[PDB]
Amino acid sequence: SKLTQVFKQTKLCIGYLTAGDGGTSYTIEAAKALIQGGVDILELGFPFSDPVADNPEIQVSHDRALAENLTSETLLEIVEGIRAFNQEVPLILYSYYNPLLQRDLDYLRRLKDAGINGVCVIDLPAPLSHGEKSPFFEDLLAVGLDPILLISAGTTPERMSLIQEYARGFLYYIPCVGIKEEFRKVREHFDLPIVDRRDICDKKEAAHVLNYSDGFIVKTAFVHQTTMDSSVETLTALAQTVIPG
Amino acid sequence: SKLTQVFKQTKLCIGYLTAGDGGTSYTIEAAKALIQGGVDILELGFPFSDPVADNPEIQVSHDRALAENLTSETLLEIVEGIRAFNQEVPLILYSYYNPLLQRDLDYLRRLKDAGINGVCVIDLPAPLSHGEKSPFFEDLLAVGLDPILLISAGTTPERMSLIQEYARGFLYYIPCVGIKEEFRKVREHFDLPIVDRRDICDKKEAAHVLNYSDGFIVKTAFVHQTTMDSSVETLTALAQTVIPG
Amino acid sequence: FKHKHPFGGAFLPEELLAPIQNLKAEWEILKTQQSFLSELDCILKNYAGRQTPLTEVKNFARAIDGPRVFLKREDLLHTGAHKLNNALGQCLLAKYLGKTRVVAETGAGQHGVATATACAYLGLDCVVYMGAKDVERQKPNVEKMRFLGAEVVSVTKGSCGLKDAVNQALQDWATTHSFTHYCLGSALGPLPYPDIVRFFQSVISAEVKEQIHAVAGRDPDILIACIGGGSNAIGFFHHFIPNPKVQLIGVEGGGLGISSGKHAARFATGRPGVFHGFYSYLLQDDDGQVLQTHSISAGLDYPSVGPDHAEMHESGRAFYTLATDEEALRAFFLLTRNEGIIPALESSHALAHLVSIAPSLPKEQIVIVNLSGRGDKDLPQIIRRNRGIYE
Amino acid sequence: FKHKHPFGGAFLPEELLAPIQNLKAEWEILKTQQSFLSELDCILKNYAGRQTPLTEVKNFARAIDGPRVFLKREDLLHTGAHKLNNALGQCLLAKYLGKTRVVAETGAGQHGVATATACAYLGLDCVVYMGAKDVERQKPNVEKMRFLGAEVVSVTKGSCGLKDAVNQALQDWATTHSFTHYCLGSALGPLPYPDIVRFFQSVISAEVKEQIHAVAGRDPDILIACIGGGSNAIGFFHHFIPNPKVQLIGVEGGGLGISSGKHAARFATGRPGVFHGFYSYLLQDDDGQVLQTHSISAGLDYPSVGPDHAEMHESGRAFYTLATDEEALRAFFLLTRNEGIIPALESSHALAHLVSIAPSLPKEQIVIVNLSGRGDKDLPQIIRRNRGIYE
Numbered sequence A, B: 001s002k003l004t005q006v007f008k009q010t011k012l013c014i015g016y017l018t019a020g021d022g023g024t025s026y027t028i029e030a031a032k033a034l035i036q037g038g039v040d041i042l043e044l045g046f047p048f049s050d051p052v053a054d055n056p057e058i059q060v061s062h063d064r065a066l067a068e069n070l071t072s073e074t075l076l077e078i079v080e081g082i083r084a085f086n087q088e089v090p091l092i093l094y095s096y097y098n099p100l101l102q103r104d105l106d107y108l109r110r111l112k113d114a115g116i117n118g119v120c121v122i123d124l125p126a127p128l129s130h131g132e133k134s135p136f137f138e139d140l141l142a143v144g145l146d147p148i149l150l151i152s153a154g155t156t157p158e159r160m161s162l163i164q165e166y167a168r169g170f171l172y173y174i175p176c177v178g179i180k181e182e183f184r185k186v187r188e189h190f191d192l193p194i195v196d197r198r199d200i201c202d203k204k205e206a207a208h209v210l211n212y213s214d215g216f217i218v219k220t221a222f223v224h225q226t227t228m229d230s231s232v233e234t235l236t237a238l239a240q241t242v243i244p245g
Numbered sequence C, D: 001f002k003h004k005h006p007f008g009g010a011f012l013p014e015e016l017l018a019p020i021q022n023l024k025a026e027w028e029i030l031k032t033q034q035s036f037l038s039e040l041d042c043i044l045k046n047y048a049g050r051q052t053p054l055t056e057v058k059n060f061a062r063a064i065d066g067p068r069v070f071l072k073r074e075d076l077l078h079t080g081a082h083k084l085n086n087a088l089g090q091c092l093l094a095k096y097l098g099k100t101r102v103v104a105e106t107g108a109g110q111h112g113v114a115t116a117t118a119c120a121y122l123g124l125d126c127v128v129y130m131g132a133k134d135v136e137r138q139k140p141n142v143e144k145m146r147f148l149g150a151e152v153v154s155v156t157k158g159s160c161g162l163k164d165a166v167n168q169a170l171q172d173w174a175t176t177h178s179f180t181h182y183c184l185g186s187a188l189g190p191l192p193y194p195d196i197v198r199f200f201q202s203v204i205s206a207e208v209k210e211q212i213h214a215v216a217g218r219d220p221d222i223l224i225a226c227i228g229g230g231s232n233a234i235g236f237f238h239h240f241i242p243n244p245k246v247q248l249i250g251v252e253g254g255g256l257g258i259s260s261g262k263h264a265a266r267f268a269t270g271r272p273g274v275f276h277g278f279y280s281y282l283l284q285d286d287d288g289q290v291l292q293t294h295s296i297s298a299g300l301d302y303p304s305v306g307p308d309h310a311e312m313h314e315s316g317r318a319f320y321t322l323a324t325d326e327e328a329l330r331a332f333f334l335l336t337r338n339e340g341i342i343p344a345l346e347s348s349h350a351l352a353h354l355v356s357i358a359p360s361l362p363k364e365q366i367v368i369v370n371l372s373g374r375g376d377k378d379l380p381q382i383i384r385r386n387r388g389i390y391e
């Protein structure tokens, strides 16, 4: 409803930040800097102690955030600090399953109320059997959060059905050439925006990705920049050079 | 014939030296010093690389003699140097079997000619079967050397026969009280002097041993003294304090 | 019990779904293929030394005031621990599925050595990812894996630890799985690895069943095994699980005790959570972040435990307890001095639990402890402790 | 041949004649006592892990261009070497003769560990004499023997070496033999020890005979074993000696080669002599003083060899050759990388001889090498050599 609105504009930039890396205040400052820099959707990482599906840069980022005492409670503070700045920009919570599995339905409602619009759970795949349901994806739908799912070329038709069941907002796509047609068949099957999940870090590749994808994600570059010079002005600047046009 | 002569006197002192410990000249000097000190029989050790039947003091003495290049040839020089001083004192060659097994019959003759009168081979026991002969003990008898054998209380009668076959000069005895009678039965069985093989190092025990033994042996004290102060005068002096009367 | 998921599962990112589905489908065919089962049997006999003996330890039993005590001697297996049962099974599986390459990760190197050993004997390219900090700490096992022909990749990315090697290994498998098998060391992981590892360790209890019937004419009263991830215990338990007269005891690393927080006793203080692709008991804080663990024995020093043990913990079928470092150290010395068998510090946790219950057991009872490995590898660390004599 | 004595014998000082005669008389009765043979059988099976497997090593064979090659896996025995066969036999013999104590001496500690292991399992007081200089060099094996409950006597008398420990041990036995057995580690020593040790190692070839007939239906063409004192080789050869179609090869430690004088190859340059109570081939100078030896492997680094091999060398029944340190090192790496079996540097001498003759053997021939022990104990020394890759 808020993600669906933002994709009425075309060719969006998603920016990743690790919640709590540098502390609560810093995370809020960095998010402001990315928004002012033109980022259309914030992907806010719930840091996990064992993020085996993320590249080492993001692993060390998660380590920093947890050593600075990010909790399920200060994450709410962070989201509320962002929403005290901007209440239009969609917020995706990116997370491993366990920190959310250990919370309850009420925490999901508190996330929605704080400002979160979508939840991407990187190690919780949509159920394989056409019958079998997903307690957590059901819980997301029940409170109005958009489950942000990931599909591949080899996605079995059994997923396609159940992935279509729970997917809302937009779908991430992890491709392998004529990839443009490749995205169109996916996009027409789901009637949702399809975003290339690959890590973009320069303007040339972002413009390339947008030929066929409805957006691109800057996963590493922003986090890496906070380790070079953490002054958030350089995050605004980095966004402006990466986003085409 | 020369050992038998010396035991016509009673209560003899046997003194041990390692041939070649300190070199050829020193060994000859030490032997002179012991003779002047009253020693009646020299027991001259052929140093062996692996004298497992000797106490550590004598083991290290053998090590020194071989590192100073004692050979089967300089041993002849040593014996000839002693005989150029004194041609009455009996000389016992004390040895392990292998340095003599590796020589030949002619070397035994050369030993006899140099001045050796008896040979004690500590790891060559008299043969066990009443029939079986000993090539080396035969070789000793053939050239006129006295085989100096060792008996224990538990000597089997099978030995007693063959030990009596080859024994000449005197017998060493290694006892366990009424040990006086114990020696008399042995002495009367063999009609040879019986010498207590135990290491004597003070006058009190030497006098004690001579109550029942035809002599005593100073095995360690002289060698040990060459390591305290090698000046051979102190060997003469040490002999004089150890030999009773 | 209130659970959103059955224990186990496959909580995987998309890029691992196809590799895991292929393995599962391939494995269902292979585990009943007689030629594969026969060849694995021959290798375990003529190369690894199965079957391992069952040793009655009468001096040890006497010294701890215990009943009839037997040791299943997985210390006598080639490489000195049960881990080779699974390494040979999975690397033979790789060969049969047409893989030419096997990839693993390792922390202390025990699993890396077993995998490298199986790959050398079977002629497979072997690649072991290891965090650079562990490479520096384990140069002997690194040299051993390299002598066994493995490529040891020193991971200098990220924080240079097990976590970073795991990420590197899984990234490799996602790229290379059409020709590379990924070899998991314990009864952990996404389906089908808990089934695969359990299947290859079940030979332990099949042997024990024959051997204990040969010397005693009946099943044991008690089975005790240590629990790192769960693989030696589940294989040791497997063929006795349906006998309700056989008690099943799993002993975790108790470290400095529960009160100190320095331990690895998932079932003492942990609770269910999703970690490394599966759902099981997990040492985790209120937010679900995985907790740091401690054990004198590095083979037990894990925050996770295999889902088959989670099932038996909640079903009440098996008793999961712990032994502290110092109880494990004492049992180590007791077995060494009384039987001349030098046990691994891992298995010494099983031994320790027997030491503490032995006087209460009636003397006619039969206890089998699974001696999961030999302890020569633990001697340098134990010698550094400078312990005096134990009784 | 011109010899004043048959090989062997008992060239002993008087104080050892009674102990040696008692042992001999007692042993003649015991070696045919069925209850003793049965109990030793049971212990070797349920405690030591016999029977050890016979492993065909097809990758190794291929890599050296060799024929059909099998390894008798004495590395899989408890303690990791064949020495325990003899330690358990002699310590069981002690127990049966009523001894409560066993005394030994040791240089590197390998024999001390085996004896201490057997004494712990059998409940005998164990005392190991060791020169203080060796204690300092072998603190890991000293700690192991002490953990196994042995008293390790550090000999600080004399020159504090093996020679001084031997003297201390024999002095102890001469005093204590009425209740102490003296345990000799190899097929050396005064009669009856060469017969006793050979009797307890013959189980190796009894097993090989059954195992090679099971896989191939015929006796092997070639048996290769390393020779330190001779015990693993004579037991490995024993049941094939009467078959003239079986070649017997013993491989000694060649060190830096014969020309350098730094080796342990008794049969290359030695000659008969009397040493430590027996007559056999001996590395000795013109005067009969025993020569210093060298080998990369301390288990081969001896100037002596057992009299049964001397007999077969002069009879022409067996071929005694050597391998240099570097041939042994290369074979070590070849076996490790191609089969995942880490051999002892001792056995690597046997392997090395096979490596150098393999291409000339017709491919249908069957070669069995006796893998007398595992090489984990040799890894620290080999890692220090910093060798590159061998082919």
Ligand SMILES: OC[C@H]1O[C@@](CO)(O[C@H]2O[C@H](CO)[C@@H](O)[C@H](O)[C@H]2O)[C@@H](O)[C@@H]1O
Pocket (backbone or CB within 6 Å): C127, C151, C153, C168, C171, C172, C173, C175, C176
């Ligand atoms: O970081 C390794 C990375 O590269 C790949 C191929 O893209 O594998 C290569 O590197 C491995 C590590 O050394 C080699 O073992 C392998 O042979 C080589 O292809 C990926 O599989 C891996 O993720």
Ligand SMILES: OC[C@H]1O[C@@](CO)(O[C@H]2O[C@H](CO)[C@@H](O)[C@H](O)[C@H]2O)[C@@H](O)[C@@H]1O
Pocket (backbone or CB within 6 Å): C257, C258, C259, C260, C261, C262, C269, C270, C271, C282, C283, C284, C285, C286, C291
């Ligand atoms: O963070 C507290 C949380 O951790 C658990 C393990 O999941 O227990 C740990 O913390 C306890 C409190 O310090 C310790 O007693 C225990 O030893 C330690 O492992 C949970 O019990 C608790 O909810």
Ligand SMILES: OC[C@H]1O[C@@](CO)(O[C@H]2O[C@H](CO)[C@@H](O)[C@H](O)[C@H]2O)[C@@H](O)[C@@H]1O
Pocket (backbone or CB within 6 Å): D127, D151, D153, D168, D171, D172, D173, D175, D176
């Ligand atoms: O130097 C040892 C010496 O003493 C004897 C007894 O006289 O043995 C004693 O010392 C041994 C070494 O510690 C102990 O093992 C033994 O228990 C003790 O009786 C002799 O046997 C030995 O030659």
Ligand SMILES: OC[C@H]1O[C@@](CO)(O[C@H]2O[C@H](CO)[C@@H](O)[C@H](O)[C@H]2O)[C@@H](O)[C@@H]1O
Pocket (backbone or CB within 6 Å): D257, D258, D259, D260, D261, D262, D269, D270, D271, D282, D283, D284, D285, D286, D291
């Ligand atoms: O002292 C010479 C003597 O030693 C023997 C071994 O008994 O050989 C040794 O000496 C040779 C000359 O240096 C070396 O070539 C040989 O390697 C070494 O072991 C005898 O052959 C020789 O008579």
